[PDB]
Design a protein around this nucleic acid. Structure first.
Lengths: 142, 176, 38, 209
RNA sequence: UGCUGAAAGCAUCUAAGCACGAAACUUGCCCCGAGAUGAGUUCUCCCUGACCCUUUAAGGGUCCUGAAGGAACGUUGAAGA
RNA sequence: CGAUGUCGGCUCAUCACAUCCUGGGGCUGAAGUAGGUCCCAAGGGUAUGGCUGUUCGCCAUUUAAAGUGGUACGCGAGCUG
RNA sequence: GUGAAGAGGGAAACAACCCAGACCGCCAGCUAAGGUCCCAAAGUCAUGGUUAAGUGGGAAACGAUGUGGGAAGGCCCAGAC
């Protein structure tokens, strides 16, 4: 016998939700990425879709360790002459708190579009509610 | 870390009410303060106080050594508060209070025209004396530090906003 | 002012103070001796 | 701030007793009809939908005619939804015209730029030509200041090329109001307006302090 | 530029706790911009159909009836190689 | 070694900061007007002619700067000789 | 001594340095160096100390009560900072 080779007809989708209250960004984002890739359901294939759909309940409830609100510079550039554009958690969290985890998982997912195939299953919200009550997302613990 | 041992002492004019983290203190300075013992625990003996460390919070007597000073500053704040020391020098220079807006004339294009924070009053018993009124030892020192910063004291003229202090920053002239 | 690169403790009215990660000179008898860094 | 849509006609002079002739750009107003009045129902916002003047409408489509039926009985020009600012702008009472300019004296004017064809660099972008002197031939007006050496590798907008320019939105803020008459429906300003006669000239009072 | 203040009785802008501020900068203005594949919104307009065969859960044929609209084809231009 | 054509000029900018002009703070043997002069920062801004191939060096006259530098010590499928 | 005329795993890179020698197939297992956060597989490893610098993962004089552990010396319970 051969080991399990996945057919594209195997694909399945279910909805989940997790509370962010007092949780440190990297210890939430790593746990989120592991569930986003579908490691509780399907594995041993990048040739077929394995992930499940997951909501971060309220991004404004997230924290960072010690003084790390001032840590990192988030450098990026493409053109319009020189000058590197920089950011800080202190300037994101009061503008759009959803942004701080939207950027965090991008090094935790594999390669180029192979990680984007899982990023399509991610949802983030702020304001203690979401728009997906008709999908009935089940609660995660802790 | 020695100062957490201290008795602090309180006057008869304070009743010192406590429930969990919440301490309720009032007196004849028109204030009713509710202050927190959240990271440290305090015990009262009607005239004296003792501080110590809490479960799940910082060990030793260091963060307790700060909490005594803030509670003493509020027992003072609700009873009589803190005395004047800010002064102005220069003829035609003037301090004035327009409700929650303050004015300071320094021979310039506009008289500051700035609006006060929450929980503070200003008073001018003469046009070169500035008094700040309230119960929080911090706001009455912070607003004086934001006010002294307008144009800053001049070296030879001596003119501007100054403190009562035996040190002199006014400079004397030299022969050429 | 100046910074130069090193500080001396030349008088008794000078004590030298480290504030918010930086060391500085202040002298209440003589402002001529204000200095940053050390 | 609502735009009054004035159209381009020309310039005149108007004089004063000191012999100064005072050249001024002419705009003659016809103002809005007002054709929807949006309030709260879509994305919480307020917007007027202005519609300017009248048009012959001799071949209009049913997607346009079914909207003209709810706008009124006479068909106007353009649309311009014009979103209103909270506590700053109103739709209530009589519809407004040139009272917009009764004390504000700077204005802005949007229009459509003229077509430059090739456009180039030595006229449009203030570049120097090469001289036909000292036995020099074959490259006098041809662009070529695009690199070094191999170092650049990628191009930024400080480098300029040929290709179609014009026929897009252009706005000017140089204009100063010299005379207004609400009974003659006239606006006179100092300085010139972009593009061709007719056109649109959206025209609104300045919001810079 | 800093306030209240500990570790280090004092002293301190920092440790707990919280302020001011540059010709710089985000919003604001002016222009671009939903391939923003995360492709958003809203209004105005229109159409109310059947049959045969087969190695077909799919293809190949025929007929009724084509809206709202768009373009070609023209007369050319404020647009243009 | 089966060839990254020679110096300066014109065209053309663009990056750095041990900041030249602009800003922010300061000591002065800075009473005031000027002057001397050190930290902090890359938003905006920094001369033409004579002889001379010479940029340059010298000079004439001008600056808020004519700043100190990098760019195959920035110039040819770009030009002049 | 290896390489020059010796592939393979490792040092993500790197004839040679480290480890180890190449018949061919394994629906095998055990070991080498190296690795065990995460792209990227195997400790979110355990015990104790160190540590605000993102040093670790580029850098000296010197300076601060930086700071863990220690002994000798002065100031000292009749009494010291």
């Amino acid at each position: 016998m051969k080991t399990f080779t996945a057919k594209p007809e195997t694909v399945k989708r279910d909805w989940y939700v997790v509370d962010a209250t007092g949780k440190t960004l990297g210890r939430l984002a790593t746990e989120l990425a592991r569930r986003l890739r579908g490691k509780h359901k399907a594995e041993y294939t990048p040739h077929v879709d394995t992930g499940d759909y997951i909501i971060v309940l309220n991004a404004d409830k997230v924290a960072v360790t010690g003084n790390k609100r001032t840590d990192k510079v988030y450098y990026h550039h493409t053109g319009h002459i020189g000058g590197i554009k920089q950011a800080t958690f202190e300037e994101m969290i009061a503008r759009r708190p959803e942004r701080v985890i939207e950027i965090a998982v991008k090094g935790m997912l594999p390669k180029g579009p192979l990680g984007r195939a899982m990023f399509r299953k991610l949802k983030v919200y702020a304001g203690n509610e979401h728009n997906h009550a008709a999908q009935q997302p089940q609660v995660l613990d802790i | 870390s020695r100062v957490a041992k201290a008795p602090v002492v309180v006057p008869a004019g304070v009743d010192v009410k406590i429930n969990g983290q919440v301490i309720t203190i009032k007196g004849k300075n028109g204030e009713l303060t509710r202050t927190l013992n959240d990271a440290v625990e305090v015990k009262h003996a009607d005239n004296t106080l003792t501080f110590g460390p809490r479960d799940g919070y910082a060990d030793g007597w260091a963060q307790a050594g700060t909490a005594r000073a803030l509670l003493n500053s509020m027992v003072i704040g609700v009873t009589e508060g803190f005395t004047k020391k800010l002064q102005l020098v220069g003829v035609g220079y003037r301090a004035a209070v327009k409700g929650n807006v303050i004015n300071l004339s320094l021979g310039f294009s506009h008289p500051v025209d700035h609006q006060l924070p929450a929980g503070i009053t200003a008073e001018c018993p003469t046009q070169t004396e500035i008094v700040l009124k309230g119960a929080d030892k911090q706001v009455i020192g912070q607003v004086a530090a934001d006010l002294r910063a307008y144009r800053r004291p001049e070296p030879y003229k001596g003119k501007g906003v100054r403190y009562a202090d035996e040190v002199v920053r006014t400079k004397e002239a030299k022969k050429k | 002012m100046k910074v130069r690169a090193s500080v001396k403790k030349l008088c008794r009215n000078c004590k030298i103070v480290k504030r918010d990660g930086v060391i500085r000179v202040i002298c209440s008898a003589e402002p001529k001796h204000k200095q940053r860094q050390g | 701030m609502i735009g009054l849509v004035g159209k381009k006609v020309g310039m005149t002079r108007i004089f004063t007793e000191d012999g100064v002739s005072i050249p001024v750009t002419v705009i003659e107003v016809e103002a809005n009809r007002v054709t929807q009045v949006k309030d709260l129902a879509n994305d919480g916002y307020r917007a007027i939908q202005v519609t300017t003047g009248a048009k012959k409408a001799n071949r209009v489509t049913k997607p346009e005619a079914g909207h003209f039926a709810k706008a009124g009985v006479e068909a106007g020009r353009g649309l311009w939804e014009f979103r209103l600012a909270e506590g700053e702008e109103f739709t209530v009472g009589q519809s407004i015209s040139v009272e917009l300019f009764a004390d504000v004296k700077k204005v802005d004017v949007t229009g459509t730029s003229k077509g430059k064809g090739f456009a180039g660099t030595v006229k449009r972008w203030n570049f120097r030509t090469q001289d036909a002197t000292h036995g020099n031939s074959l490259s006098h007006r041809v662009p070529g200041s695009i690199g070094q050496n191999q170092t650049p590798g990628k191009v930024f907008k400080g480098k300029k090329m040929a290709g179609q320019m014009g026929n897009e939105r252009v706005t000017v803020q140089s204009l100063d109001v010299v005379r207004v008459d609400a009974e003659r429906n006239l606006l006179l300003v100092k300085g010139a307006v972009p593009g061709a006669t007719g056109s649109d000239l959206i025209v609104k009072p300045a919001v810079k302090a």
